[PDB]
Write an enzyme that holds these catalytic residues in place. Structure first.
Site, PDB file in Angstrom:
ATOM      1  CG  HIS A  62      39.009  13.618  34.713  1.00  0.00           C
ATOM      2  ND1 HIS A  62      39.278  13.732  35.581  1.00  0.00           N
ATOM      3  CD2 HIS A  62      39.298  13.028  33.484  1.00  0.00           C
ATOM      4  CE1 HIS A  62      38.777  12.371  35.430  1.00  0.00           C
ATOM      5  NE2 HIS A  62      39.171  11.881  34.563  1.00  0.00           N
ATOM      6  CG  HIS A  92      43.009  20.225  28.108  1.00  0.00           C
ATOM      7  ND1 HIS A  92      43.719  19.183  27.912  1.00  0.00           N
ATOM      8  CD2 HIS A  92      42.890  20.183  29.358  1.00  0.00           C
ATOM      9  CE1 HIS A  92      44.712  19.029  28.597  1.00  0.00           C
ATOM     10  NE2 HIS A  92      44.539  20.073  29.774  1.00  0.00           N
ATOM     11  CG  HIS A  94      42.827  22.871  34.120  1.00  0.00           C
ATOM     12  ND1 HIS A  94      43.170  21.596  34.241  1.00  0.00           N
ATOM     13  CD2 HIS A  94      43.923  22.694  33.089  1.00  0.00           C
ATOM     14  CE1 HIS A  94      44.208  20.697  33.625  1.00  0.00           C
ATOM     15  NE2 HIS A  94      44.045  21.375  33.102  1.00  0.00           N
ATOM     16  CD  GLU A 104      45.937  22.360  35.688  1.00  0.00           C
ATOM     17  OE1 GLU A 104      46.339  21.920  34.584  1.00  0.00           O
ATOM     18  OE2 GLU A 104      45.370  21.359  36.991  1.00  0.00           O
ATOM     19  CG  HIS A 117      46.878  23.354  30.493  1.00  0.00           C
ATOM     20  ND1 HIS A 117      46.810  22.434  30.456  1.00  0.00           N
ATOM     21  CD2 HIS A 117      47.742  24.291  30.095  1.00  0.00           C
ATOM     22  CE1 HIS A 117      47.521  23.061  32.169  1.00  0.00           C
ATOM     23  NE2 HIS A 117      47.599  24.000  31.490  1.00  0.00           N
ATOM     24  CB  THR A 196      48.181  19.911  35.151  1.00  0.00           C
ATOM     25  OG1 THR A 196      47.589  19.267  34.534  1.00  0.00           O
ATOM     26  CG2 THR A 196      49.235  20.610  35.464  1.00  0.00           C
TER      27      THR A 196
HETATM   28  N1  LIG Z   1      47.217  19.277  32.159  1.00  0.00           N
HETATM   29  S1  LIG Z   1      47.717  18.490  31.042  1.00  0.00           S
HETATM   30  O1  LIG Z   1      47.812  19.148  29.598  1.00  0.00           O
HETATM   31  O2  LIG Z   1      49.123  19.057  31.726  1.00  0.00           O
HETATM   32  N2  LIG Z   1      47.678  16.976  31.245  1.00  0.00           N
HETATM   33  C1  LIG Z   1      46.808  16.813  30.645  1.00  0.00           C
HETATM   34  C2  LIG Z   1      46.654  15.554  29.365  1.00  0.00           C
HETATM   35  C3  LIG Z   1      47.423  16.206  28.281  1.00  0.00           C
HETATM   36  S2  LIG Z   1      47.249  14.640  27.160  1.00  0.00           S
HETATM   37  C4  LIG Z   1      47.548  13.823  28.475  1.00  0.00           C
HETATM   38  C5  LIG Z   1      47.002  12.439  28.641  1.00  0.00           C
HETATM   39  C6  LIG Z   1      46.408  11.466  29.284  1.00  0.00           C
HETATM   40  C7  LIG Z   1      46.250  11.783  30.573  1.00  0.00           C
HETATM   41  C8  LIG Z   1      46.148  13.447  31.120  1.00  0.00           C
HETATM   42  C9  LIG Z   1      47.133  14.190  29.920  1.00  0.00           C
HETATM   43 ZN   LIG Z   2      45.536  20.816  31.446  1.00  0.00          ZN
END
Ligand SMILES: NS(=O)(=O)NCc1csc2ccccc12
Ligand SMILES: [Zn+2]
Length: 258
Positions: A62, A92, A94, A104, A117, A196
């Site tokens: 992803h 990470h 996007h 985003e 992020h 997100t």
């Molecule tokens: N884009 S985000 O940072 O909002 N979500 C990404 C994310 C960060 S830790 C984690 C743990 C499980 C699933 C997704 C995520």
């Molecule tokens: Zn993110």
């Protein structure tokens, strides 16, 4: 047939497996700068990444995650809208297929080339798993990326992407200092939101910096060479791995500045 960003498993499909996708505090959102209000109750934001210990980088199909050792109180975020200490666990990005899209969150509907992020969990909950069961379990520091001059502190990340081209690949990634990814100003907007990406849990206090960092065209081009697919599978370039703005609903975005 799991979630992703394509036409058949993208953002408009997530609600089927994750109903909360149509929830009351989903992220990201468009930040209407004129509607955001300066909040005097916000304390100064404190980003302490001097003792941060990165461990490795991973392509999860992803995006790619730079993971940190969060077994101790090292890299922490506090102050601002936060009560207590939040510990850095990973970061990470996007990004888009073109410089005109990728972020985003949007600012007055403007989309940046990418968005970083930095994910943190509230230490009062013991661990990340327990934190994501709480309304204030997480804090994500979001930083916009625009294309222009290169970001020196990002090159180390760019140069290791060749070793984790496909889904499932990881590489040792120690001694990376995330302080090199921050802009000069810490002015920010904040609001209650969610992850997100599925599971889209509504456990996040978002802190989005107003000042974007500049990265070079060559740096973001390398982000776009990554693959969504695993090794030995048809190539699906990892681009446009962003979720679009969601309904603000019953929420107010607060600004740390006037
Ligand atoms: N884009 S985000 O940072 O909002 N979500 C990404 C994310 C960060 S830790 C984690 C743990 C499980 C699933 C997704 C995520
Ligand atoms: Zn993110």
């Amino acid at each position: 047939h799991h979630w992703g960003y394509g036409k058949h498993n993208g953002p408009e499909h997530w609600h089927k497996d994750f109903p909360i996708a149509k929830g009351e505090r989903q992220s990201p959102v468009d930040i209407d700068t004129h509607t955001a209000k300066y909040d005097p109750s916000l304390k100064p934001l404190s980003v302490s990444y001097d003792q941060a210990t990165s461990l490795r980088i991973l392509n999860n199909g992803h995006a790619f995650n730079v993971e940190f050792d969060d077994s101790q109180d090292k890299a922490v975020l506090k102050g601002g809208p936060l009560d207590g200490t939040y510990r850095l666990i990973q970061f990470h990005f996007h990004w888009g297929s073109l410089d005109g899209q990728g972020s985003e969150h949007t600012v007055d509907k403007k989309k940046y080339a990418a968005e970083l992020h930095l994910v943190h969990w509230n230490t009062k909950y013991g661990d990340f798993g327990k934190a994501v069961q709480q309304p204030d379990g997480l804090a994500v520091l979001g930083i916009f990326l625009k294309v222009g001059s290169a970001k020196p502190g990002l090159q180390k990340v760019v140069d290791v992407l060749d070793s984790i081209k496909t889904k499932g690949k990881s590489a040792d990634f120690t001694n990376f200092d995330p302080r090199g990814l921050l802009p000069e100003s810490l002015d920010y907007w904040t609001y209650p939101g969610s992850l997100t990406t599925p599971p889209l849990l509504e456990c996040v206090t978002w802190i989005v910096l107003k000042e974007p960092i500049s990265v070079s065209s060559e740096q973001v081009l390398k982000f776009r060479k990554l693959n969504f697919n695993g090794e030995g599978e048809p190539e699906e370039l990892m681009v446009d791995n962003w979720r679009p703005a969601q309904p603000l609903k019953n929420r107010q975005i607060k600004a740390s500045f006037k």
